[PDB]
Amino acid sequence: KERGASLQHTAPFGCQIATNPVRAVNCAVGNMPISIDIPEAAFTRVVDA
Amino acid sequence: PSLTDMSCEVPACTHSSDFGGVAVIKYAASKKGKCAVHSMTNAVTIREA
C-alpha cells in the first residue's frame, strides 16, 4: 500500500525499467565507442568515383 | 601524332612500392595513333610503356 513510485517513474536520465529479467533500458548517460573493420571490397577508388 | 594543350592531375598517390600512384593526363591529339610514355626522373617509374 505504501510502495510509492517505481524506478521506471523516478529514475534519472529517462531510464525505462523492466523485470524478468531486471534491466534498465535506454539510459541517456555518457557515450559509446564503436570500432568498425571495413573490408577493401567496400571501398571505391577516387578514379572510380 | 602530335599532342598539345596537355595537363596532368594525380587523383591519388601512395608510395606502396607497387605502382600505388595514379596520374591522369589530358591531351589534344592532332590525329589518332600511338605515343610512347617515359618518366623524366629516376624517382618516379611509369608502369605503361
UniProtKB/TrEMBL annotation, chain A:
Q: Which cysteines are joined by disulfide bonds?
A: 15-27
Compartments in which it is found: Host Golgi apparatus, Host trans-Golgi network; Host cell membrane; Host cytoplasm; Host endoplasmic reticulum
Determine the domain of life of the protein's source. Answer: Viruses
Subunit: Homodimer. Homomultimer. Interacts with host karyopherin KPNA4; this interaction allows the nuclear import of the viral capsid protein. Interacts with spike glycoprotein E2. Interacts with host IRAK1; the interaction leads to inhibition of IRAK1-dependent signaling.
Main role? Answer: Provides the signal sequence for the translocation of the precursor of protein E3/E2 to the host endoplasmic reticulum. Furin-cleaved E3 remains associated with spike glycoprotein E1 and mediates pH protection of the latter during the transport via the secretory pathway. After virion release from the host cell, the assembly protein E3 is gradually released in the extracellular space. Acts as a viroporin that participates in virus glycoprotein processing and transport to the plasma membrane, cell permeabilization and budding of viral particles. Disrupts the calcium homeostasis of the cell, probably at the endoplasmic reticulum level. This leads to cytoplasmic calcium elevation. Because of its lipophilic properties, the 6K protein is postulated to influence the selection of lipids that interact with the transmembrane domains of the glycoproteins, which, in turn, affects the deformability of the bilayer required for the extreme curvature that occurs as budding proceeds.
The molecule here is called Structural polyprotein
| Source organism of this protein record | Chikungunya virus
Q: Which residues of the full protein are shown?
A: 1054 to 1102 of 1248
From TrEMBL, chain B:
Kindly list the places in or outside the cell where this protein is found, as annotated in its UniProt entry: Host Golgi apparatus, Host trans-Golgi network; Host cell membrane; Host cytoplasm; Host endoplasmic reticulum
Q: How does it assemble?
A: Homodimer. Homomultimer. Interacts with host karyopherin KPNA4; this interaction allows the nuclear import of the viral capsid protein. Interacts with spike glycoprotein E2. Interacts with host IRAK1; the interaction leads to inhibition of IRAK1-dependent signaling. The precursor of protein E3/E2 and E1 form a heterodimer shortly after synthesis.
> What is the role of this chain?
Provides the signal sequence for the translocation of the precursor of protein E3/E2 to the host endoplasmic reticulum. Furin-cleaved E3 remains associated with spike glycoprotein E1 and mediates pH protection of the latter during the transport via the secretory pathway. After virion release from the host cell, the assembly protein E3 is gradually released in the extracellular space. Acts as a viroporin that participates in virus glycoprotein processing and transport to the plasma membrane, cell permeabilization and budding of viral particles. Disrupts the calcium homeostasis of the cell, probably at the endoplasmic reticulum level. This leads to cytoplasmic calcium elevation. Because of its lipophilic properties, the 6K protein is postulated to influence the selection of lipids that interact with the transmembrane domains of the glycoproteins, which, in turn, affects the deformability of the bilayer required for the extreme curvature that occurs as budding proceeds.
What is this protein identified as?
Structural polyprotein
From which organism does this entry originate? Chikungunya virus (CHIKV)
